[PDB]
Amino acid sequence: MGAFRFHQYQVVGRGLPTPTDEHPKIYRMKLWATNEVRAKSKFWYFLRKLKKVKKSNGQILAINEIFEKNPTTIKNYGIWLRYQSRTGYHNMYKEYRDTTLNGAVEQMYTEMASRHRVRFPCIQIIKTATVHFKLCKRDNTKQFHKSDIKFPLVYRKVRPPTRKLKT
RNA sequence: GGUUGCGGCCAUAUCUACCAGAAAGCACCGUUUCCCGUCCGAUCAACUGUGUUAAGCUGGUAGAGCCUGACCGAGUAGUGUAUGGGUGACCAUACGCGAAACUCAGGUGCUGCAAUCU
């Protein structure tokens, strides 16, 4: 797409470390990011969150990025999310209608921001999980979109400029 | 298998069942007249052996104590560094760091010199 929204960067690496029969074992976090600036950062924050490491103990092997595999079209992304507001972070599973992973980020940001309290310092999320169109449960925007694929309903929905013409 | 002189590391050796340095490489007991302790040979200061392995040193064997690690607790509490949010107080954020228990493990010692042995 044009001027990102957060392509997920599949960052991989190691650790890589010391003269001991240990070594840390092989990891992944695929993190949504804008390129390498973000790439680094997330990895250190993941390494803080779950793992423990260090900066130095986490070694990055490689990077491979993100465009559109499947259709622009029409997941309605199930997102596992955390929002920081008037104390620390509270858990969320938000399943919202989207075009795509580029979009998902913006639509969630706008939702943390507006609705939930969000401001600067945050981060992000935990996972995004695709779903089948009929399955989608919570609920307002999407319920209409699910119905549209159905169709008929696309003949519905067809509404927005509608009051304007004359014909 | 090493007992023991002299040590060092000095909580991996504090404490409480019971097997072993030992027919001429101990401790004990016996002379405790005496140099010697006195208030009593007990303390001690001395001279020695019926023999006895019971204690003693130390070696054999078990738990609370404890160091050291692994395991979660899993980078958590806390923290210098740069800064966003909150009404306040207060919080977070990236940059570097990172204690408490838990359970499991190792060890009821180590190491060196000599009196150097059946």
The one-letter code for the residue type at A93 is Y
- Å: A70 CA to B6 C1': 84
N- to C-terminal Cα distance for chain A?
36
Q: Give the CA angle between residues A103, A107, A111 to the nearest 5°.
A: 170
Neighbours of A154 (CB within 10 A): 12
Give the closest residue to A77 by CA, choosing from A59, A101, A53.
Answer: A101
| Contact between residue A94 and residue A111 where contact means Cβ atoms under 8 Å apart | yes
Q: How far is the CA of A70 from the C1' of B72 (A)?
A: 41
Distance in angstroms (rounded) separating the CA atoms of residues A127 and A31: 9
Ramachandran region, residue A47 (left: φ > 0; alpha: ψ -120 to 50; beta: rest): alpha
Distance CA A5 to C1' B47 in A: 106
Residues contacting A92, CB < 8 A, separation 6+: A79, A80, A81, A82, A83, A116
A32, burial (CB in 10 Å: exposed 0-12, middle 13-18, buried 19+): buried
Asked how this structure was determined, the answer is: cryo-EM
DSSP chain A: --S-S-EEEEEEE-----SSS-----EEEEEEESSHHHHHHHHHHHIIIII---STT--EEEEE----SS-SS----EEEEEEE-SSSEEEEEEE---S-HHHHHHHHHHHHHHTTT--SS---EEEEE---GGG--S-HHHHHHHHHHTSSSSTTT--TTTTS---
Nearest Cα residue to A76 out of A55, A94, A56: A94
A141 contacts: CB under 8 Å, gap ≥ 6: A96, A97
- Near-strand B residues (CB closer than 7 A): A 40-41, 44-45, 48-56, 84, 86-89, 119-123
CA A114 to C1' B60, in angstroms, rounded, equals: 77
Structure token pair of residue A39 = 């790439």
Positions in chain B where some atom is under 7 Å from a protein CB:
74-76, 84-86, 91-98
What value does the CA radius of gyration of chain A take, rounded to a whole number of Å? 20
Backbone angles phi, psi at A115, to 5 degrees: -70, -55
- Note the resolution in Å, 1 decimal: 8.8
